Amino acid sequence: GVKYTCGACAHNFSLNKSDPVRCKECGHRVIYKARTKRMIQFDAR
Amino acid sequence: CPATVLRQWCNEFHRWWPPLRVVILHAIGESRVKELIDSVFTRGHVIITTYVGLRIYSKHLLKRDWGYAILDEGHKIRNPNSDISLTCKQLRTPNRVILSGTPIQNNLTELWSLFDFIFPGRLGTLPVFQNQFAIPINVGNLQVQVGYKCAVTLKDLISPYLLRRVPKKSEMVLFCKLTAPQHALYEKFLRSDELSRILQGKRQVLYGIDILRKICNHPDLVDVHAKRRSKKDPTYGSASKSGKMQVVKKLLELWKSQGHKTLLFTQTRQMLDILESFLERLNAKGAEEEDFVPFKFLRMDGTTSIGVRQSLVDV
Amino acid sequence: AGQNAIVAIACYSGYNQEDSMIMNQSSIDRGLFRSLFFRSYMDQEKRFGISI
Ligand SMILES: [Zn+2]
């Protein structure tokens, strides 16, 4: 569920509370919580 | 006697000399122990005690007089100034015998403290014992001959106070090197504020040599998340990073197919997790392929119960 | 840094006095001087002991 995305290598993934901060394939420790697919509603004004 | 030989010690009484009565220091052999005290001196002949149990009922034991004294523990007395002397050397009897073939393992201070229990000080006080020959033995001509006589005097003074009696073995010691990731973590910890802070005095060197041994066993043990990934992260163990896995993999597999029951020896239960993940991965590799045999390890420690012991020791 | 906006000089509303200005609401609705602000909160786990 909780998805994660790599720095610039565009690796998409998901860490759990069992592993350190490390992009699984690129070996990049600057990872980013992948955005929520959930819709956000706006007022357009 | 220790708690691992309590029933044993009562057993030889029962078998060799039934006429000798015996009473262990437990619920059987706060008033109940006092009715136990009733006729434990006239009717009771020999009293048994675990060397943790004296300070459970010492209120009514150290008071009355005693005869012959036996202590089957020569490594839980060691040097003076401990709870040992507090509950032991206050006994009232010349007869004092210790049953242990390894009394001297750390220093002659342990020798003096062990001689104190048997004899009232045929040598002298602790300051006297030290100032006599402590430094000369350590430093040592200018030392040898005078030291030789000062030591043979001690040998003749204590020799009639402790008896002394004594396949093949191969001792191969392998000198492996620190790996590059190991050398990096070694230099990083080597040049840090905490080491100097320990040296100056606010902390103890015991916590700085435990962490530099923590890195020699393998790199992945100096991590702050040790418990959080010990048994739930199958990358915590790894291999070839410790500088000793290769001389472990090769050396253990040279006996795995050779069928040689071998002993793997550690000191920490934390490194057991790493060597256990490693051997489970070895098991997985062997089971996936063929013409092999399961590694079949087991781990024993203080975490387990006193009941298990012999069972695994037997299996 | 800034925008080129339309200003006229007069005393029409009486609210323009004393360092106050009167604004066109249409420009604001269209987004004149609308902007984006960003605030970064930094957080971290800490070591009370070595394993704590
Ligand atoms: Zn990556």
Q: DSSP of A1-45, one letter per residue?
A: ---EE-SSS--EE---TTS-S--TTT--S--EEPPP-S-------
Cβ-contact B73, B98 below 8 angstroms: yes
Would you call B299 helix, strand, or coil by DSSP?
A: coil
Q: Cα separation of B98 and B115, whole Å?
A: 10
Cβ-contact B273, B236 below 8 angstroms: yes
> B95: which 2 tokens?
């007869």
Minimum CA–CA partner of B224 in chain A: A20
> C25: which 2 tokens?
């609401």
Identity (one letter) of the amino acid at B253?
A: E
Q: Cα separation of B287 and B297, whole Å?
A: 15
Q: Inspect the interface and report whether the beta carbons of B226 and C47 lie closer than 8 Å.
A: no
Q: Cα separation of B240 and B84, whole Å?
A: 45
Nearest to B119 by CA among B89, B78, B156, B83: B89
Identity (one letter) of the amino acid at B60?
A: H
Which residues make Cβ contacts (< 8 Å) with residue C15, sequence separation at least 6?
C22
> B245: which 2 tokens?
């896995």
Q: What determination technique applies here?
A: cryo-EM
Q: Element (H or E) spanning B259, and its range? A: none
Q: Cα separation of C39 and C35, whole Å?
A: 14
Would you call B22 helix, strand, or coil by DSSP?
A: strand
Residues of C labelled as active-site residues: 19
Chain B positions contacting chain C at CB under 8 Å are: 224, 226-227
| A37: Cα within 13 Å, side-chain hemisphere | 4
CB atoms within 10 A of CB A23: 20
Cβ-contact B263, B299 below 8 angstroms: no
Q: Cα separation of C17 and C12, whole Å?
A: 10
Distance B245 CA to ligand 1 centre (A): 29
B neighbours by CB contacts (3+ pairs under 8 Å):
A, C
Domain boundaries along the sequence of chain A = 1-45
Nearest to B234 by CA among B283, B288, B298: B283
**DSSP per position, B252-315:** HHHHHTTT-------S-HHHHHHHHHHHHHHHHHHHHSSS----------TTS-TTTTHHHHH-
Query: Using a CB-CB distance cutoff of 8 angstroms, which residues of chain B are in contact with residue A18?
Result: 228-229, 232-233
User: Is A9 part of any known ligand binding site?
Assistant: yes
Query: Using a CB-CB distance cutoff of 8 angstroms, which residues of chain B are in contact with residue A20?
Result: 225, 229
C neighbours by CB contacts (3+ pairs under 8 Å):
B
What is the domain class of A1-45 according to CATH?
A: mainly beta
Q: Cα separation of B257 and B248, whole Å?
A: 14
Query: Using a CB-CB distance cutoff of 8 angstroms, which residues of chain A are in contact with residue B232?
Result: 18
Q: Cα separation of C52 and C45, whole Å?
A: 11
Identity (one letter) of the amino acid at B82?
A: S
Q: Cα separation of B122 and B254, whole Å?
A: 56
Sheet holding A12-13, edge to edge: A12-13, A4-5, A32-33
**Residue B204 φ then ψ, to 5°:** -110, 150
Distance A27 CA to ligand 1 centre (A): 6
Identity (one letter) of the amino acid at B107?
A: N
Cβ-contact B129, B135 below 8 angstroms: no
Distance A15 CA to ligand 1 centre (A): 12
| Longest Cα separation, chain C | 71
> C15: which 2 tokens?
């609210």
Any idea what DSSP says for residue B59? G
Q: Cα separation of A9 and B24, whole Å?
A: 72
Within B58-122, where are the H helices? 83-86, 108-118
Cβ-contact A31, A5 below 8 angstroms: yes
Minimum CA–CA partner of A19 in chain B: B233
Minimum CA–CA partner of B228 in chain C: C51
Parallel/antiparallel/unpaired status of strands B70-71 and B97-98: parallel
Cβ-contact B284, B292 below 8 angstroms: no
Query: Using a CB-CB distance cutoff of 8 angstroms, which residues of chain B are in contact with residue A19?
Result: 229, 233, 235
